[PDB]
Amino acid sequence: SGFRKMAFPSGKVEGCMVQVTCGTTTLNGLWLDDVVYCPRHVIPNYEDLLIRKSNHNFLVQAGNVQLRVIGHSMQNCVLKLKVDTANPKTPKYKFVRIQPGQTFSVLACYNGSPSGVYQCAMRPNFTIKGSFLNGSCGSVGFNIDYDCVSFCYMHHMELPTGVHAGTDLEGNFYGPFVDRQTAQAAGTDTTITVNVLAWLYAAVINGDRWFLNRFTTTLNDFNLVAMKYNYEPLTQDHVDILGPLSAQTGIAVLDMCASLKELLQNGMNGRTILGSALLEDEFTPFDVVRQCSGVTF
Amino acid sequence: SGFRKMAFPSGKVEGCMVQVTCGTTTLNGLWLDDVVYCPRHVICTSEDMLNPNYEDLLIRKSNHNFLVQAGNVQLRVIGHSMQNCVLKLKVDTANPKTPKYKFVRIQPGQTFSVLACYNGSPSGVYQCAMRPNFTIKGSFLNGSCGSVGFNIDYDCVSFCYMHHMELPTGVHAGTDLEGNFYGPFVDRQTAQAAGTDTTITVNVLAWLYAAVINGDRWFLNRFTTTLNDFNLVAMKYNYEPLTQDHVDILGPLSAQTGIAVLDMCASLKELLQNGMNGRTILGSALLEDEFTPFDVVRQCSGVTF
């Protein structure tokens, strides 16, 4: 029993965190094999700034050891520093681009040193509601599948509303953001409907059924209600993805949609679901299945 | 900016998780130097759980009855002893991944990270608090026994909890790393129930200071309160009594924001009376009590917005 926002064990990622200093700027880097990956803003016309730099300008520190930079190149908004030593702690890994609604763990670092780990979701507006201070740039987001780490996010900046923006590990930003000081704002955010439904199934699994009713609905009637409350449209794919949770609890996806419709139209009335007075949208159907099953790494 | 429930990086603890099997029971162990620590109920059957005589069950065991597995390697047990509700298995190999560590007993209200494991393999990490009733609201399934709670301050891991059981309400009970239970619990399957739980007042106040640091002041009022009048109101909402120690502990957060502890107590009094009226504090519609004054200082900046 119990339901917590759970992050993946961070150990395989901790062994890759390094500190990168270029001039007066100090941020975090990801050391995989003989390459250190970090935000290119550590050095705007980035090619013009980069052509003026030499290898010895980049100071890379792995714990108490100085790594020697022997090459450098840019890929989109990420800087790739060729180092003279391969990371002996390099885990099995892939660079993957996630979609809005998908969740990941973040290992927040300062000065190449990990300070904390938390779980979060890529919002529909492509920002993440993280917890970062100055020096956090270069902190990474990831998931684990058995022994393989899938790096999906590198932190670049904080927007005026306090939310965060960054790139995949190939330097491509999530969202209409640019790496520079300009008027940038997060677009209007929406609620991840498929995630809220998954969390209602998690509540039913943990013995919370007060919100269930005898009614069902069409996908078309529910999507009109979803549009009114700033909820993301629910697609047939989302319905298919919720299949296992529907079969496990005996509550059809459209049957659970009618419960969500009544929660949107009438509130919680002093009640909570899994210790929360708000409808939670940062647990995917897979997160619910994994946490209510016991999958290890 | 931002405020999340943050756990400590789990890497130093992952390198200590092992699997312990005794007969048909398999649970997790903590391998530090040449000793593996695990719940003593690993020597029990389900029948034994009603009235187990651990000393009688242990005297019938030999070293080779205990199977310890570290990854794909079998560790050899060369000794065994019991310390309170923990079994200590002497092994022939010291853990090369042993970090700098201490065993610390925490008090209710204190927070820690939990590395949840099954079969000596870590599956997830989360942050939680020792409730006033000595239980923890964790997320554990069968096979989680022996999972550990910890804090990492600097490079030293302070182990404070080892998981032993789930109570009928779904909450969790366990021991410190010396085998002493938190709460009036026994590692016996009897009528055991968690006492009535209360809200950790000093933690709720710390989280209100965290909200003020992140730029939100809508909940503040022009009133102050005495410590005794605050406790007379808060007890009515099942909040823990606030002591002079708690007031002293909130000192740095009060000085950083310029809001006296008893003025923040007056805002808390008003929040309990009025609710939130469609508003949230740090993205939450409930008053959060699982962030200590120390956690807030750690996660928040020294400059108030």
Ligand SMILES: CNC(=O)CN1Cc2ccc(Cl)cc2[C@H](C(=O)Nc2cncc3cc(S(C)(=O)=O)ccc23)C1
């Ligand atoms: C809000 N930041 C600023 O006004 C200055 N920024 C300008 C800038 C422009 C482009 C890019 Cl790609 C990066 C950046 C830098 C940036 O966003 N870094 C930060 C990232 N994450 C959390 C941060 C928390 C803070 S805080 C309030 O001190 O908690 C500050 C800075 C953070 C620096």
Ligand SMILES: CNC(=O)CN1Cc2ccc(Cl)cc2[C@H](C(=O)Nc2cncc3cc(S(C)(=O)=O)ccc23)C1
């Ligand atoms: C609720 N407990 C049981 O049905 C059986 N238990 C009785 C018992 C009595 C004393 C002691 Cl010290 C240990 C234990 C064992 C026990 O508590 N282990 C478990 C630990 N943590 C989470 C657990 C989740 C579950 S569950 C419903 O499947 O989520 C089951 C078992 C868990 C075994």
Ligand SMILES: [Cl-]
């Ligand atoms: Cl303590």
